[PDB]
Structure formats: C-alpha cells, structure tokens
Design a protein around this nucleic acid. Structure first.
Ligand code: ZN
Lengths: 46, 50, 93
RNA sequence: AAUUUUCUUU
RNA sequence: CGCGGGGUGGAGCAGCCUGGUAGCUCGUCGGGCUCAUAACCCGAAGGUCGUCGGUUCAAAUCCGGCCCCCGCAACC
RNA sequence: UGACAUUGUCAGGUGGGGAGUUUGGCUGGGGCGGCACAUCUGUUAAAAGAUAACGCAGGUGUCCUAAGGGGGACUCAUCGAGAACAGAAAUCUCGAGUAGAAUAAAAGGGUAAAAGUCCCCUUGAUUUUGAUUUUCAGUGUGAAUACAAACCAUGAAAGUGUGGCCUAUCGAUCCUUUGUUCCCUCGAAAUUUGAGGACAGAGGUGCCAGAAAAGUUACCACAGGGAUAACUGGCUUGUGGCAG
RNA sequence: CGAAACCACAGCCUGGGGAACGGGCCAGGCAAAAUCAGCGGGGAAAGAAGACCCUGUUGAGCUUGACUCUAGUUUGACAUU
RNA sequence: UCUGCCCAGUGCUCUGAAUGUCAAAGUGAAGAAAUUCAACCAAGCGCGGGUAAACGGCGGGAGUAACUAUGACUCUCUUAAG
RNA sequence: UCUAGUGGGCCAUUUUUGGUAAGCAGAACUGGCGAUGCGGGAUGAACCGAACGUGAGGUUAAGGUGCCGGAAUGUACGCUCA
RNA sequence: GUAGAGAUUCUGACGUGCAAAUCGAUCUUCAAAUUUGGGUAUAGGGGCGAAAGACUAAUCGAACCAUCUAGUAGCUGGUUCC
RNA sequence: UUUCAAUGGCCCGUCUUGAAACACGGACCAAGGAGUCUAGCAUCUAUGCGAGUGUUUGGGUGAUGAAAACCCAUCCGCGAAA
C-alpha cells in the first residue's frame, strides 16, 4: 500500500515513477535501483 | 506514511543469528614472529560454520 | 498613443504661476530602496522560522497600466505629474 | 566508382 | 520584471565577430544523351537578411528601440 | 592518515523521507458546461418611478496629439442625364436629393450654413475649492452636471472649451515608488548622510467593497439538510400506443 | 421458576381532503363480554442522530512539478590550524 | 520457447569541455561612514550514455496481385516506433 | 434616542415571461395565510362572508329550507328519462 | 488418512444464542516453509507484517490512559409563572 | 362530584410556506435541569454635589470587641480648550 512502500498503491501493480533514484535520496525513498549508472539487459561490454 | 522495511532493518529483529557460530575468522595478530620470520602451527579441526 | 515631447500648460510652481512650456517624459518606478521602513519590517518578519509571512500576489488581470506624464519646466525647474487613460501602446514624438 | 530493361512471329 | 541568445530565398542552413561584393543544400525550371527506356547532366533564378532611428567615404552586419520565440533568475 | 579530514557557526542547492495548510461563488441537486460575479444598449418593462430568471438580441476592460478645443468653408448616401472612355460612371459635370450617409468600436437617442467632410490655430486631456445627479445605506468606487478662484486656447466678437455628441470602457487598507515645500520630526545640543511624516499621483487586487492556495479516498469520519440529489410516492404527457 | 425488545395515546374497513397512501379529521359501511393455538397483510413495525447525495469557509488516511517549511544530504566560507 | 523498435518526455548516471549562471567570505572603486560593481562555490542542467529479463510509448492513408473488389508487398504521414 | 426579532416565504385575482405542461420556475398590482379564530363551500391556510374581551335580546352576510339538519314536500311558468 | 493444526460449502442450526463469532455435517493439511509451552526483544506516526491497511489485550487507514479541555461549531435539540 | 343525553373537540413540543401526519422527541412518576458573574461600552432613569467632582492607594480614633461605621492630607482620574 502507499503507506507502506513508495511502490505501493494503484489499481494495477506498478511503480508509477522511475525505479532509478538519485544517490542522495532520503531514507524511506531510497528504494529500487539506487544511483543506477545504466539499466536493462546488456549484450557485450567490459 | 509509514516507516518502510529498509528503514526498519536497523537492528533488533534483523540482527544476525550467531549462537551456533564457532568464532570470528581473523587470521592472527601481527607479532614479531610473523614480522621477522615465520611461525609453524598445526591445523587440528575443520568445521562447518552455520 | 502619441504624445508630443513638449506642451505648453499651466505651471503650478511658485515662481511660475502661468502657462509655460514643459518637456514631457514618461514616469518610471524607482529602484526600490532597501532602507525603507516597510522593507526593514518585512525583512525582520521574514527572518527566522515560520516561512512566508505576507501575501504574494499571483493573479494578473488588467494587463495594461496607467500612463504617467512627467512635465518638466524648462527654466522654472518644476516637475509635475499628469495621468492618462489606460493604453497598450505609448510613444513620444 | 558506375552501367537495370529489351512482349509474344513473319 | 532583470539579463542573455535567435529571426536571412518556397523550405532548411552560412556569412555578422575579420561595415566595402548577400552564399550553400533541399526544391522548381531548360533540356539532348545512355540507338531506343530508366537514370543522368550543367546552369538559371527565387531574400524588405522582421520594424524604426543613428553612424561613417559606406551598415543584414556596428549601436539603440520595437514585434515574435527561447533559456536562467527573482517576484509584499 | 594528517594540518587534510572530523567537529562547531553561517550561507547556497536539493530534499512528499516527513510536518502544517489550502485546493472560490452562482447553479432548477451537485459535477461538466457557462458567467447571468464589476459593467453598457434595445426588449421582457404591463405609457410616472421601481422591477427577476443559466429570459432574448448584442456589447465592454480598448482606441484617439487627434478621433480633444475653438473658428471658418461646404453638404452627405443615393437617383437621372452627360464626356472621351469602353463597362468604369475610372475621373470630370449639371440637376433631384429631410439625411435613406457619416459621426472609432454594441445598440439606442441626437446632429444639415452641423455634432458630418475639409482647412487654420492650439493643448480646457491645466491647478485648486465647494455644490449637485446616477448606482445609493442617499456609505464607498466608477461615471456625470452646473458653478467659483487662476492661467490659457480659439475666434472680429458674442461666446465656447475643466477630454472624446450622450448613455460602458474600471480599483480600498498596508507596502513600495514619484512629485511638491526657503514644510515638520529623529525627543541632551549641533552639521552632513540616512530615515520617518503632511499633500498630490502611480505600481492591484477581473471572485472587480480588493484571501497568498493542487488532487484522491472503491478504507473513511463528524455536524446537519428532505432548503438538496438517488430512492419514495404525488403532479405533468414533450414520445410511443390507442380511439373518433 | 421466570425475562427482554418496544411503548405520544391507541388500534375494524371504504371514499374524500390533507405535508400529495390516515387509527383519529369529514361522509358512509358498521358495531356485544372474556379468551386459546397459529399467522405473517398492515401498524409507511423494531434497531442505529442514512454508510448513498449535498452543505459546512468541519476533519482524517493517501498522492503530487499545490503553498509554506523541515530531518537528512551536497557544496563553500570562517575557527579548530 | 522468446523477450522486437524507441532516449523526444520524465527519472538515473557521467567529464563538467558548456563556463552560461551565481549565496556567504575576500579582494578595489568611491564616501566621513552606514552603503554598489568584478571574481568565487558546487551544482543540476545544455551534452554523452544506458537501453527495457529499469518509468513508459509503439496507428492509420494510399498504389496494389488480372483491374477497380482484395490487402499480401510497397511509401510517405506523428515520430520514440511498426 | 436606544434596542429586539426578521433578512427560507406561501396562496388567490388581475398583467405576464421561460417551458408540452405541471400542485413548475421567475417578475408587477392588490387582498390574504404565515400570526386569523368564527359562519358557509360535506371535509380544507389562502375561496365566499366576516376579523374575535365575558353575556342577554333582536337582525343579518355568505350559504340554505325532503330527512340526516335549524328553516316552505313554498308559489308561478317551462324543459329533461339518462 | 488418526491425533494435532485450520475453516470450503450447507450461504445448515443459532442469531434479545451455549457463545460480543458458538454448534453440527461436510471440507483443507497432517513428518515439515509443521504445531506449540515458557523465557526474551521490538511501543504509537512507532512496532510488526509470505502484504489483508492486516495485527499491535473484544479498540487500528495511527492503541489505551490523564491533561490542555467546560477545545470550536455560521449546525441539531432544549430553554421553567400569570 | 359522578354519569347520562344533544352538539362540538385529531397528540403535545419543534424545524417549517405548510404537521394529526406515513417528519423528529416523548412508556410512567419523583427530585435536579439551562441568559449567570466579571472588565468595559451605549441609551434611559434615580440620587448627591456642581466648574467642579471622586472618603475606602493610604493614614487615625484601635484597646477595648471592631473585615462595619466615622474622620483625615498630598497626588491622581474625568471635566473646565481646541
Ligand atoms: Zn515652472
């Protein structure tokens, strides 16, 4: 539920906002992918 | 709102279960023997740490 | 509206109580000095905790503004203020 | 570099 | 409101700072040639450089004002 | 490691992680729509005055250094007949021509040696005081009228002019800003900065007598309302059906 | 042996009018003690200051680029130096 | 067994090369002082990236193939995308 | 001079506006109910008559005189069989 | 499939009950992510949550107790003799 | 006083245009039960003094018996000037 988690709530199970949160996020909103340089499937890199 | 589980993991319920653990796995204190020569020890037990 | 740069009108100055020639310029608001008593009172009120303490206007009806003419006596060195009706275009000469 | 096409017969 | 930037052929872009002559691409138009079809060819034009004022031997350009758009900042 | 870092103070950025609070009114229920929320014209308006509806037809938040003021000259829109023209009455004419034109913008009223067109000169679209009209509570705001004290403009002059021929075209307190004076005060006495006062304007509140203000609740709560909807009846018959 | 809910007063119908479906009002049908067991038409039966809708310049949970802030966090200056 | 296209938007991250900003403090220009300009601190952004086993988005019109019916192929239209 | 309550109105005649119409909504005049009892319209806030201290007697208004019900099963002239 | 642990359906009984959640039949699971006693820890914008806004002493979309507090109410009810 | 007979008589309070209402409260009775006090203001009235008015901030008779009555001085409030 929205009271429990930032991802809670909605008529469908969806985050609603981006799951990539800034590095300097306050506790309680620093959920998901913290300071994600990149996201998704990668096919070949160093 | 309400305090989330990540914030609630500060301790208490979320502490490590260390009753059955046999001890910390630190190597040894760096002493004169290890700094200038060597010291010989004999391994006597090999145990499973939960 | 078009306004001439010079008009001969009544001078209310002490040394010129007759119709003299006045140079016409548009009045403009001053630079809003920080030493005014109201400004000092507002700064004191805003200092500290409590947030905004006075209303901040947000609705902007009446797009135009009244035009103020600043008549200047050529020799009497007397400044007079006149008010025109609201207009969208103003020009001198 | 670049060059595709030639209807069914007499 | 304060500051800064841009407006240029039918369209999209340089030239401005390095005042002396306004250019490029897309596009349109003109073909005879690849024997004959495609395809092709080179050139030609098309701009009050948004408006007004000032300057100099001379202003799209340099300066100022105005129209439109944009960005930042502030807003008893 | 090291005079960095840490810590303390201050400052800029960020910060629904969290806190507090808002998220108009009218409405043939409320919501959507709209503004009937400040205003003007004709009608509803029933020949004094007043008079409503989310009644009808429409307007307004502008515009004009002239489209203000004065003086002078002329008469407009159309119609008939003419000239070369070559459809064109282009232009130039003579007659008829009560306004059927124009008068900035909606409508109504008014206007012909003008209130219309043209020409000349000007800035009465100036300073100040009181009285009065409309909306009115005879409060405010807006608008307007007739005077008075000065300075003027225009005419030969009588006169006219205190913006637009009349009826709409707009704004309190506080604050800021400008102008004004041989202006007053900064209170122990002085000078200069600075600041505060009195008078006259401007910066705006269009929810227009003027709060600084985004949503959801299909988890919901309270005080109430049949002033108010769904239901509940009752009334009505615009549709369908039926009968002459 | 032994209650409770409920209770303005009470209780047979039709039509009329009426706050637009009356037990009482008006006009009629009518009308005879005291009781038992069922019954579910009516008493617009009982419970509960409607949970739907609207109003309130009444709230709360939640959300956000609403307004105003804030823990935290980032950077700088000064001191420690 | 597959997980297609897309970084324009909002989030994330990055070098700040934008140097394009700019609060305190410090420097200097005036004044007799109270009092303005330059410079500075990072930003985040403007760029780059990532690319969906991360937020999210992904139609229709036409010539048609012996016609014109068609609806495969094709090409432009919003583009981030058939 | 001081102050209360009021600032939801409604009905009828006439003049109307919007609506198919409404026991609908919105205006004008007057009379009323609200706050108005009484007689009549069988019953009723508005309709008719009439505005009310406690009583006696008389007379009326509107409305009635077959019975309920107080009062002529009165008079005169006609019409009507449902 | 028994004990144990639960509660699908009968929308059965009861529904001023035996009971502020029970009874009967039926049903799920039953050697593990099993059930459970005692001790202990986490406390209200907090805890805990295999996530229902669920549980936190019959009280949960923010427990209980006392106080501020006789909180405010443009709202409802009442407001005493001639 | 009871009862009978004729005629009349709807259940009170409340919100309301409108209540007997199928609108709300009311099973019955006893006791309790709601415009008070204070700091001001305004009008009116009464009393005392009057260009003055106000003894009780305070002091004395005081000790008896004295929260009372009585007496007493300087300021001060309002008014006499805007
Ligand atoms: Zn002068």
């Amino acid at each position: 539920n929205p009271v429990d988690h930032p991802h809670g709530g909605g008529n469908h199970q969806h985050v609603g906002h981006s799951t990539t949160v800034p590095r300097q996020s306050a506790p309680g909103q620093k959920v998901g992918l913290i300071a994600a340089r990149r996201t998704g499937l990668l096919r070949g890199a160093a | 709102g309400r305090v989330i589980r990540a914030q609630r993991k500060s301790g208490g319920i979320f502490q490590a279960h260390t009753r059955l653990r046999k001890g910390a796995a630190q190597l040894r204190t760096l002493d004169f023997a290890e700094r200038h020569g060597y010291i010989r020890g004999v391994v006597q037990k090999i145990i499973h740490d939960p | 509206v078009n306004i001439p740069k010079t008009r001969k009108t009544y001078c209310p100055g002490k040394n010129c109580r007759k119709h003299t020639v006045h140079r016409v310029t548009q009045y403009k608001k001053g630079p809003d000095s920080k030493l005014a008593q109201g400004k000092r009172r507002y700064d004191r009120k805003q200092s500290g905790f409590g947030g905004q303490t006075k209303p901040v206007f947000h609705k902007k009806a009446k797009v135009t503004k009244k035009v103020v003419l600043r008549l200047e006596c050529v020799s009497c060195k007397y400044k007079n203020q006149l008010v025109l009706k609201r207009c969208k275009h103003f020009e001198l000469g």
